[PDB]
Design an enzyme around this catalytic site. Structure first.
Site, PDB file in Angstrom:
ATOM      1  CG  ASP A   9      -1.760   1.203   1.413  1.00  0.00           C
ATOM      2  OD1 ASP A   9      -1.694   2.175   0.617  1.00  0.00           O
ATOM      3  OD2 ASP A   9      -2.526   1.191   2.397  1.00  0.00           O
ATOM      4  CE  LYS A  70      -1.647   7.267  -3.597  1.00  0.00           C
ATOM      5  NZ  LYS A  70      -1.990   6.226  -2.585  1.00  0.00           N
ATOM      6  CD  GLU A 174      -4.870   3.772  -2.725  1.00  0.00           C
ATOM      7  OE1 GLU A 174      -5.758   4.547  -2.288  1.00  0.00           O
ATOM      8  OE2 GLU A 174      -3.694   4.139  -2.972  1.00  0.00           O
ATOM      9  CG  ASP A 198      -9.116   4.642   1.915  1.00  0.00           C
ATOM     10  OD1 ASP A 198      -8.544   5.136   2.906  1.00  0.00           O
ATOM     11  OD2 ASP A 198      -8.544   3.866   1.115  1.00  0.00           O
TER      12      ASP A 198
HETATM   13 MG   LIG Z   1      -1.808   4.075   3.800  1.00  0.00          MG
END
Ligand SMILES: [Mg+2]
Ligand SMILES: Nc1ncnc2c1ncn2[C@@H]1O[C@H](COP(=O)(O)OP(=O)(O)O)[C@@H](O)[C@H]1O
Lengths: 379, 81
Positions: A9, A70, A174, A198
């Site tokens: 992840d 990211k 994800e 999330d």
């Molecule tokens: Mg994470």
């Protein structure tokens, strides 16, 4: 005796590795005993720091401490969102033919790195964590990305894996990995509607998927600038105000003091998910004044109540786009480190009318867990 | 187990402009610019004058193929003029 593959992840603010061995997933602790690692890279006069070591010295070395890569990976320098994000980072971002590069001082020299190089250093650390546990070199990996990442972001995330010496078996979403962790492809109950909620450290993603026979996205919603960081900052501002009242001094323009306060607030916030009260101490916070205090869970909830409540709006929006009633969501899944906040869990549960929500896998580990399963399936 | 991430071949869009919603259905081999052309036919505003918004990055172009954006089946966009 063949080498296992790993699931990674690669998160905006923390990363996490798992491996499937002997019928079971292991989420792998690093050499601090920690199962998540900060997606941070730092450059000093003498060395390159990765993870906790990098995040620990951010207050002293902010110009050469990189994070949020990211938000840059696969992106163009001229992207308004990139230009907007750059105003909040203490590190320099420069333009190389419309490709952004992070520029820092390293061993006395000016060096510049592509986003995928920064991320490849995080992935190297995650690779080394797995290798310390398995006892052999690891060469194969599945890496996860947000479901809304485009071809360019996926390709650059894969490039970061190749630079770290990994064979990238596959890039998967994800929310797919989170559903895999809960066996949601294996209910044997036909087609299912799944909502992934999330809430991480920097971003909030709501995804609605259908899953039928191992085939997995019907709607998405969220906020790429809402996460645990914003809850930390509500605490920061609260204590900035408390510090004014007690000492008649304003610390908010001292960048080192604010960052040191932010670190301590993030730790207190975590404690408030297991206790109703937390203490906080920083020596020489400002003008050599020691700061020490406490806060209750109730007070923290009040400081963040509007932010917490705002998470339901993307849930309603995604349900509207998917043309589904809340009662037609068969599986509700809470993932991301911020879903450990009890008030957040209670607001979602009430919204879904008292339903028991999928929370027995650690929510900041479920994405790595599902990536590890996918990895084993591909070996 | 086997795990497949299916990209929908037909994409549904609800595009908001001021008081009004424009529904758009097209194949994921189409471009973003083809959405704008449908918007021009519905709104009678030239594509030149619209800022089509709602994507997850700020580098989407008229030539961008919708498949490359890994979009959900049902999408929400909006237009600024
Ligand atoms: Mg994470
Ligand atoms: N026990 C906890 N209570 C409250 N928040 C937590 C807890 N543990 C982690 N968090 C928060 O989770 C956020 C990061 O979540 P995570 O999903 O691990 O990273 P990412 O944002 O990279 O997905 C951070 O803001 C962190 O402070």
């Amino acid at each position: 005796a063949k080498a296992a593959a790993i699931g990674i992840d690669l998160g905006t603010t923390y990363s996490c590795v798992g491996v499937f061995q002997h019928g079971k997933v292991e989420i792998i602790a690093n050499d601090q005993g920690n199962r998540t690692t900060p997606s941070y890279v730092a450059f000093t006069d003498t060395e390159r720091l990765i993870g906790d070591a990098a995040k620990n010295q951010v207050a002293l070395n902010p110009q050469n401490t990189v994070f949020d890569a990211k938000r840059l990976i696969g992106r163009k320098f001229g992207d308004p969102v990139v230009q907007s994000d750059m105003k909040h980072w203490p590190f320099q971002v420069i333009n190389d033919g419309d490709k952004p590069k992070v520029q820092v001082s390293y061993k006395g020299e000016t060096k510049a790195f592509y986003p995928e190089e920064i991320s490849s250093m995080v992935l190297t650390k995650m690779k080394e964590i797995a290798e310390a546990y398995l006892g052999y070199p690891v060469t194969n990996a599945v890496i996860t990305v947000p479901a809304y990442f485009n071809d360019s972001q996926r390709q650059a995330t894969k490039d970061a894996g190749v630079i770290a010496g990994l064979n990238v078996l596959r890039i998967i979403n994800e929310p797919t990995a989170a559903a895999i962790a809960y066996g949601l492809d294996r209910t044997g109950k036909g087609e299912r509607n799944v909502l992934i909620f999330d809430l991480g450290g920097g971003t909030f993603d709501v995804s609605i998927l259908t899953i039928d026979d191992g085939i997995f996205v019907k709607a998405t919603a969220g906020d790429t600038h809402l996460g645990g960081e914003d809850f930390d900052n509500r605490l920061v501002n609260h204590f900035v105000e408390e510090f004014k009242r007690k000492h008649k001094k304003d610390i908010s323009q001292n960048k080192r003091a604010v960052r040191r306060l932010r670190t301590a607030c993030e730790r207190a916030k975590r404690t408030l998910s297991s206790s109703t009260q937390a203490s906080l101490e920083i020596d020489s916070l400002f003008e050599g004044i020691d700061f020490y205090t406490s806060i209750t869970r109730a007070r923290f909830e009040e400081l963040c109540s509007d932010l917490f409540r705002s998470t339901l709006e993307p849930v309603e929006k995604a349900l509207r786009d998917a043309k589904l009633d809340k009662a037609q969501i068969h599986d509700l899944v809470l993932v991301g480190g911020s879903t450990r906040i009890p008030k957040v869990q209670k607001l979602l549960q009430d919204f879904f009318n008292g339903r028991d929500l999928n929370k027995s896998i650690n929510p900041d580990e479920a994405v790595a867990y599902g990536a590890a399963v996918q990895a084993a399936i591909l070996m | 187990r086997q795990i497949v991430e299916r990209q929908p071949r037909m994409l549904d869009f609800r595009v908001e402009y001021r008081d009004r919603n424009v529904d758009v259905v097209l194949e994921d081999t189409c471009t973003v610019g083809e959405i704008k052309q449908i918007l021009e036919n519905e709104l009678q505003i030239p594509v030149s004058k619209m800022l089509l918004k709602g994507w997850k990055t700020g580098d989407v172009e008229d030539s961008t193929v919708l498949k490359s954006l890994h979009l959900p089946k049902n999408n929400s966009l909006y237009v600024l003029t």
